[PDB]
Amino acid sequence: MFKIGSVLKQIRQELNYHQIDLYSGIMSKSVYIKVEADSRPISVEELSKFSERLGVNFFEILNRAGMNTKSVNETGKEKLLISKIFTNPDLFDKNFQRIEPKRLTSLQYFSIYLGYISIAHHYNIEVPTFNKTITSDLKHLYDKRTTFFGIDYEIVSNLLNVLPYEEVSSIIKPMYPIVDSFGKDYDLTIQTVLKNALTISIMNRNLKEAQYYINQFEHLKTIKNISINGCYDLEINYLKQIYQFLTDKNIDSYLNAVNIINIFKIIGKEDIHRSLVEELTKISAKEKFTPPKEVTMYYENYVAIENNPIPEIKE
């Protein structure tokens, strides 16, 4: 299904290596030509060795082979469609009718399911089957669970967006602290849960939790080979500032938070800026405060030519 052989040849010939330089020691010149022709399957072990002989990254080879796009299988297409249905809420119905029934078919489809449920709440679309069956679904998915995979964190990240924090709380706790890295994808979803949960805590002034998520994130920087996402690290760090402000009413912290929000504008992160402004506004309100003239200036400017923004979506 993946023209891996094609890639081996391409890389081999570009690098000027001869077939002998690859199959010698590994396999027969006849069978290798069968591999490089995309007629005979290749084991990850074989590919692993060819990768070492070529001097090109294993994963890069896979990517070049066509696995560099999560559109290789069913679920892939469905996730890409979420973005589409999010800006074209008219395509919701017919599509949601097809996903809803398969929501428990695999963690993949459930993540996709929650994906639609998000679009619905956003566009104030009625999804009665949700409120009626989610607690059941979760019970079914997370009951005899001991370890969690990347999609697990993905699911909980989206869950935090369509379910009151209190219901999601108990499901999260057994998923941290994290002890190892298992890929960029895994490292990314494990940070999203933390980042969304830290946001919810702060918005609820639930500082005991916010503190917890901050420590959990901080801990991730300790783990070897874990790719800490820049943006998140910046946005989480901003939440850290507002956290210190709610704690010791320290003004420096508030300034730093505002200053961070500024940087997002300076570097071009339009949505993140819009997002954190509307956020610092609300949190300041609940605190009997009035943010600086600019922060408060952007707000009305956004909430008018925006009113109801689309949440961030990573893929």
Partner 1 sequence: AITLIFI
* Residue 104 and residue 141 in contact, taking contact as beta carbons nearer than 8 Å: yes
> By C-beta, is 27 or 200 nearer to partner 1?
200
* Residue 228 and residue 221 in contact, taking contact as beta carbons nearer than 8 Å: yes
Return the residues of window 221-250 that contact a copy of itself according to CB under 8 A. 225, 227, 229-234, 237, 248-250
State the residues that interact with partner 1 by CB under 8 A: 57, 70, 79, 82, 111-112, 115, 118, 150, 154, 157-158, 160-161, 185, 188-189, 192, 195-196, 199-200, 232, 275-276, 279, 311-315
Query: What's the first-to-final CA gap in the chain, in angstroms?
Result: 23
- Number of residues written out for the chain: 315
Binding-site partner at residue 225 among a copy of itself, partner 1, none, CB < 5 to 8 Å by type: a copy of itself
- How many Cβ atoms are within 10 Å of 141's Cβ, its own excluded? 17
Tell me which of 24, 28, 39, 57 binds a copy of itself, using CB under 8 A.
Answer: 57
CA dihedral 280, 286, 291, 294 (to 10 degrees): 50
Binding-site partner at residue 230 among a copy of itself, partner 1, none, CB < 5 to 8 Å by type: a copy of itself
Rounded (10°) angle between helices 207-220 and 230-248: 140
Q: CA-CA distance, 133 to 137, in Å (whole number)?
A: 6
Residue 262 CB, nearest distance to a copy of itself (Å)?
A: 8
Residue 282 CB, nearest distance to partner 1 (Å)?
A: 11
Return the residues of window 89-118 that contact a copy of itself according to CB under 8 A. 106-109
SS3 state at 27: coil
> By C-beta, is 47 or 163 nearer to a copy of itself?
47
> By C-beta, is 49 or 122 nearer to a copy of itself?
49
Q: Classify burial at 143, counting beta carbons within 10 Å of its beta carbon; exposed 0-12, middle 13-18, buried 19 or more.
A: exposed
63 scored as a contact of a copy of itself (CB under 8 A): yes
Residue 118 CB, nearest distance to partner 1 (Å)?
A: 6
Binding-site partner at residue 137 among partner 1, a copy of itself, none, CB < 5 to 8 Å by type: none
Binding-site partner at residue 112 among partner 1, a copy of itself, none, CB < 5 to 8 Å by type: partner 1
> By C-beta, is 69 or 124 nearer to a copy of itself?
69
- Phi-psi region at 57: left, alpha or beta (left = phi > 0; alpha = psi -120 to 50): beta
Half-sphere exposure of 119 (CA within 13 A, CB side): 23
> Residue type at 104?
L
206 scored as a contact of a copy of itself (CB under 8 A): no
Q: What angle do CA 48, 50, 56 make, to 5 degrees?
A: 85
Select from 8-16, 165-173, 190-198, 203-211 the region that touches a copy of itself (CB under 8 A).
8-16
Q: CA-CA distance, 141 to 311, in Å (whole number)?
A: 26
Tell me which of 262, 278, 303, 311 binds a copy of itself, using CB under 8 A.
Answer: 262
> By C-beta, is 125 or 207 nearer to a copy of itself?
207
136 scored as a contact of a copy of itself (CB under 8 A): no
74 scored as a contact of a copy of itself (CB under 8 A): yes
Q: Classify burial at 264, counting beta carbons within 10 Å of its beta carbon; exposed 0-12, middle 13-18, buried 19 or more.
A: buried
5 scored as a contact of a copy of itself (CB under 8 A): no
Return the residues of window 152-191 that contact a copy of itself according to CB under 8 A. 180-186
